[PDB]
Design a binder for these strands. Structure first.
Ligand SMILES: [Mg+2]
Ligand SMILES: [Mg+2]
Ligand SMILES: [Mg+2]
Ligand SMILES: [Mg+2]
Ligand SMILES: [Mg+2]
Ligand SMILES: [Mg+2]
Ligand SMILES: [Mg+2]
Ligand SMILES: [Mg+2]
Ligand SMILES: [Mg+2]
Ligand SMILES: [Mg+2]
Ligand SMILES: [Mg+2]
Ligand SMILES: [Mg+2]
Ligand SMILES: [Mg+2]
Ligand SMILES: [Mg+2]
Ligand SMILES: [Mg+2]
Ligand SMILES: [Mg+2]
Lengths: 258, 142, 171, 187
RNA sequence: CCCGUCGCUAGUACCGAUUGAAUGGCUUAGUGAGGCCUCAGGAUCUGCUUAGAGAAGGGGGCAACUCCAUCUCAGAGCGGA
RNA sequence: GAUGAUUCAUAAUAACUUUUCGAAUCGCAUGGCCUUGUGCUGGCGAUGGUUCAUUCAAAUUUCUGCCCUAUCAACUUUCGAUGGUAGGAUAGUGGCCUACCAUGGUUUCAACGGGUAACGGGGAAUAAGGGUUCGAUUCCGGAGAGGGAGCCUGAGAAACG
RNA sequence: UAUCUGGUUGAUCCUGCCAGUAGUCAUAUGCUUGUCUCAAAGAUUAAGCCAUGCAUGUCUAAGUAUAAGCAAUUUAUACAGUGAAACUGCGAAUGGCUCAUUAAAUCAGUUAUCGUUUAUUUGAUAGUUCCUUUACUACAUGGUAUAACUGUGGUAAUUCU
């Protein structure tokens, strides 16, 4: 009531952060930023719970204030800054470069990338319109506004964003035979090529998708992120490559390496 | 359908201005739109003379949300009817069903003529009145 | 008596309770937008006062033993630059930085002078800041102009190739 | 104060609701403006989210548009002659939207002279070329030009004075003029 | 085969003539605090328009007469808060 | 250009405004080029600021779903009850309120009334299967700050440290 | 973990209830009580009443400092280190507590805003104002206050002034 909430209890935090239910009543509430607080990862939980570079939030603040970490090339000395999908995170001490991509279990992965790849990111366009004085713009999935885009860029395409400038390098359209990333829903983390999309005028366009082992599935168009053509992706995929082995095959694979 | 101009105010479509200087055929500028979702705009809306601000075709409302179907049980209001949606409600203990119903007050345009017993399909709009949130988009029975 | 102050403009000799706000005497608000009903005495002098506050506007003949004999100097001099220029009756070019009043203090045998910081003083840094702002405006205006011109030639190229394909259409 | 909610009314079945909640601020309502004529007096209202709102009380002039002529002039308001909601607003001379008023009409006749060179009712070469070129558009209507002889035009208020502060309008024309004329001349 | 009237003891509810006091939801008529919007009101404070009158200093007299004046008396004003 | 769909985005014209905003702000570094003036020029920030988008939200809202009771069968409607037209007010939609008009709206498929030792849900206990009883209480939503009503400030309160 | 048994008769078979039997993040109470881990806890009656104390404040290289504060200098006679007060700016609308009200209300799942407000965050974004536009002027930078302070006081008393 009476205004915006500022706390976030543990057991209400998103489950993919993997915060243990003991050791505290509260979870780090993500501050307002480029990503929605459910589909986000604060820098405190990334630096402490995923990389183990700190033991406390106090140590995460001590890391942040000497301007070590920067996210998408900007410094961001904020504890609960929402780092989201496709953000690059640079740790100049250790010269490390991460990209936030999902593993197939549905959680954010520690995906180390090279220094050439940290110079860009992909963004899914959410709307194209005309701003004031008739200047067109696009809005990517992390809320970046890019003026004077290519006229061929319609919605649900991916644009390659330069991250030194905010300029657009190239772009991938939306049709059949395109490599997609599922970000959202039950199938979160899977990679498959799009076979066809269902019109459904009035709400919730569906799209059918099959992975490399020929397992089909279907997803709403809200959760699909095109990442290239079949064969080459435009980014480096994490380990596993979005395959979704069943639990039978998973314990068989674990009993191989054990 | 005997006069248009019955009220104390001048009934007219907003921002549709007919220039008194010119003299053509096609007597007045009439704004109409297609409501979408495959519903056909009726010719009585396109060619008529009624004003009907809450019309889904000539008026300032938009259809978005649920599309429902009912049977007309009342026409005694002015430009408003009450439809009856009948459904079966399942009770899990006895493993069977029961007849239930709701009454939905819907707005009806003068493009459409309904009587009691007709089946209509209605489209959700913004709140029209205290109870009305739905608007007739196709009358296709008798 | 009973310690209540006098408010100007009440125009009656008894007390009455007023809903008081900020920027109004006899009340200091403890919260933003807080108003408070306080009792206050009127502006008409009656026998009920304990103290009357008086100000001398024009000296008589004798010297009062408390009042016109002794002096208090004002506690601080002017601090803003044109305030100093009005205090000394200066002119625009005078280099006011030397007319600053310095108060000597001794904590010990040491003495030091602790003049104020002149405010709203012209300085090379303010001129650099103004030059930077006026430069940043023209730089953004020129940048937007080349972005618009490049997009317009892109549209011209696309429309030309669309017209060439439309030339391939229709025989 | 004035509440804008629906929980205080009866249900559609006709039942009396119980008091679920005290009156919330995001459902408030405010007293009316009742904008009179003369000696302009605009108060401000602080509304939700900052977002100032101008209660005009007692407005004097307005900007009125001639739609067939495509212009608009700042004209003085004489008085309200018709209101479709209430006759007491016509009596008390309140200015709301959809009020039929009388306006001064002298800027419109000055523009019509300066634009077309013919006077309504009853020198240089450049002006002669301009006035000859836009000929056969200086024959506006009979009803409006008879008002121009009488120096008072019928206008309709298209602005909301209690919300914006302004009392804007358009000159009545055509079939809408005939409708309100039958309303006015009705005994 | 131990109960229909009448009788003893204990308990439990009911009807109570009783014009007895105590609560409470509504409801009839009459008043109605407070803030808020509004019609006025104008303690006070202040900014500029005249310069008639009142102590010293320059351009002609190096002897009443023309510009700044330290400040008021105020009327020939406009405001604003 | 977009949408299933708009009088949409955006652009243009004519005016309006009681005239909004369009940097008199702060810290470090102190370079560059000169006809050498305290000349012109210039880095990384901090705070502010109009509009759009984004995020954190909010306010309304569609469909369906709630315990016992007929020793509750008719309820609502001069004082809005159901709808129509205009206005007003609101951040906005709407009987939300006003003016005029029409006579509607709910109900045995249980309306309306009464009772609840009734905050709702995730859930708990006990169960072969089906069920029955509970949920003030670790999370989500609501409400309240002795009882009522009114308001200031603010983006956000009908706020009770 | 798909189970029953005692009681109507002189005996019998039934209907049928009573009684036993097992559990309870159901309470209470009695008797008894060595150790390790883990843990609810003024809900029910009285959303009855409250002595006392605490629970909301906040400073960076970066808004304002002549504390008649403390320090040591040696850059710096305008300031420049640390730092009370006070002004300004944000915050105090989150959290915590309780369950009185409330029965299509709240709530749950599912929709909508093409029907709206949104501090903050993040990304974009403002050559047009010399308002009568040859200077009527300050743009190498314009005007007032006022706090803290200093001093004089009132009231039995207050976070009064
Ligand atoms: Mg936070
Ligand atoms: Mg016997
Ligand atoms: Mg309306
Ligand atoms: Mg209505
Ligand atoms: Mg209760
Ligand atoms: Mg209880
Ligand atoms: Mg709770
Ligand atoms: Mg509350
Ligand atoms: Mg209490
Ligand atoms: Mg209160
Ligand atoms: Mg308290
Ligand atoms: Mg027997
Ligand atoms: Mg026996
Ligand atoms: Mg038993
Ligand atoms: Mg709370
Ligand atoms: Mg920004």
């Amino acid at each position: 009531a009476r205004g915006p909430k500022k706390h976030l209890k543990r057991l209400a935090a998103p489950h993919h952060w993997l915060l243990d239910k003991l050791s505290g009543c509260y979870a780090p509430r993500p501050s307002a930023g480029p990503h929605k607080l459910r589909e986000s990862l604060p820098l405190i939980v990334f630096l402490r719970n995923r990389l183990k570079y700190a033991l406390n939030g106090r140590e995460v603040k001590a890391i942040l204030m000497q301007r070590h970490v920067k996210v998408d090339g900007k410094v961001r000395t904020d504890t609960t800054y929402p780092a989201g999908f496709m953000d690059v995170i640079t740790l100049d001490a250790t010269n490390e470069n991460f990209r936030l991509v999902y593993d197939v279990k549905g959680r954010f992965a520690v995906h180390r990338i090279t220094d050439e790849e940290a110079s860009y990111k992909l963004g899914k366009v959410k709307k194209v319109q005309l701003g004031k004085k008739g200047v067109p713009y696009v809005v990517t999935h992390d809320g970046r506004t890019i003026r004077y885009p290519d006229p061929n860029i319609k919605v649900n395409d991916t644009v390659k964003i330069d991250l030194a400038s905010g300029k657009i390098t190239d772009f991938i359209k939306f049709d059949a035979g395109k490599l997609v990333y599922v970000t959202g829903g039950r199938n979160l983390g899977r990679i498959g090529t799009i076979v066809h999309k269902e019109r459904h005028d009035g709400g919730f366009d569906l799209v059918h998708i099959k992975d490399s082992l020929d397992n089909t599935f279907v997803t709403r168009l809200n959760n699909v992120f095109v990442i290239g053509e079949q064969g080459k992706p435009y980014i480096s995929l994490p380990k596993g490559k979005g395959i979704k082995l069943s639990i039978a095959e998973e314990r068989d694979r674990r009993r191989a390496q054990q | 359908e005997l006069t248009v101009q019955s009220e104390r105010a001048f009934q007219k479509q907003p921002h549709i201005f007919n220039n008194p200087k010119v003299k053509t055929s096609k007597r007045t500028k009439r704004w109409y739109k297609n409501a979408g979702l495959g519903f056909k705009t009726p010719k009585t809306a396109i060619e008529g003379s009624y004003i009907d601000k809450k019309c889904p075709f000539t008026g300032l409302v938009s259809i978005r949300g649920k599309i429902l179907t009912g049977t007309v049980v009342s026409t005694k209001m002015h430009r408003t009817i009450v439809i009856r949606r009948a459904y079966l409600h399942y009770i899990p203990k006895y493993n069977r069903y029961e007849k239930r119903h709701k009454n939905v007050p819907v707005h009806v345009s003068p493009a459409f003529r309904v009587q009691v017993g007709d089946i209509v399909t209605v489209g959700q709009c913004r709140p029209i009145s205290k109870t009305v949130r739905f608007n007739v988009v196709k009358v296709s029975a008798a | 008596k009973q310690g209540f102050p006098m408010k100007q403009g009440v125009l009656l000799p008894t007390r009455i309770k007023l809903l008081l706000t900020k920027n109004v005497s006899c009340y200091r608000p403890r919260r933003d937008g807080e108003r408070k009903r306080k009792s206050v005495r009127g502006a008409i002098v009656g026998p009920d006062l304990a103290v009357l506050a008086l100000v001398i506007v024009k000296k008589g003949e004798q010297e009062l033993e408390g009042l016109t004999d002794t002096t208090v100097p004002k506690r601080l001099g002017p601090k803003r630059a044109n305030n100093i220029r009005k205090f000394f009756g200066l002119s625009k070019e005078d280099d006011v930085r030397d007319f600053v009043i310095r108060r000597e203090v001794t904590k010990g045998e040491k003495t030091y002078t602790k003049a104020p910081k002149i405010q709203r003083l012209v300085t090379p840094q303010r001129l650099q800041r103004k030059r930077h702002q006026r430069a940043l405006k023209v730089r953004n205006a020129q940048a937007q102009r080349e972005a618009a011109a490049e997009y317009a030639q892109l549209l011209a190229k696309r429309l030309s190739e669309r017209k060439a394909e439309k030339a391939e259409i229709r025989k | 104060g004035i509440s804008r909610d629906s929980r205080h009314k009866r249900s559609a079945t006709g039942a009396k609701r119980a008091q679920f909640r005290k009156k919330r601020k995001f459902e408030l309502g405010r007293q009316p403006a009742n904008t009179k004529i003369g000696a302009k007096r605009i108060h401000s209202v602080r509304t939700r989210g900052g977002n100032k709102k101008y209660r005009a009380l007692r407005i004097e002039t307005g900007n009125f548009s001639w739609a067939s002529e495509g212009i608009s002039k700042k004209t003085r308001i004489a008085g309200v002659v018709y209101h479709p909601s209430n006759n007491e607003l016509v009596r008390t001379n309140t200015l709301t939207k959809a009020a039929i008023v009388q306006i001064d009409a002298t800027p419109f006749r000055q523009w019509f002279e300066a634009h077309y060179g013919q006077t309504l009712g009853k020198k240089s070469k450049n002006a002669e070329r301009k006035w000859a070129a836009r000929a056969a558009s200086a024959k506006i209507e009979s009803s409006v030009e008879s008002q121009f002889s009488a120096g008072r035009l019928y206008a309709c208020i298209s602005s909301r004075p209690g919300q914006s502060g302004r009392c804007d309008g358009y000159i009545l024309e055509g079939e809408e003029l005939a409708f309100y004329l039958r309303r006015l001349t009705a005994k």
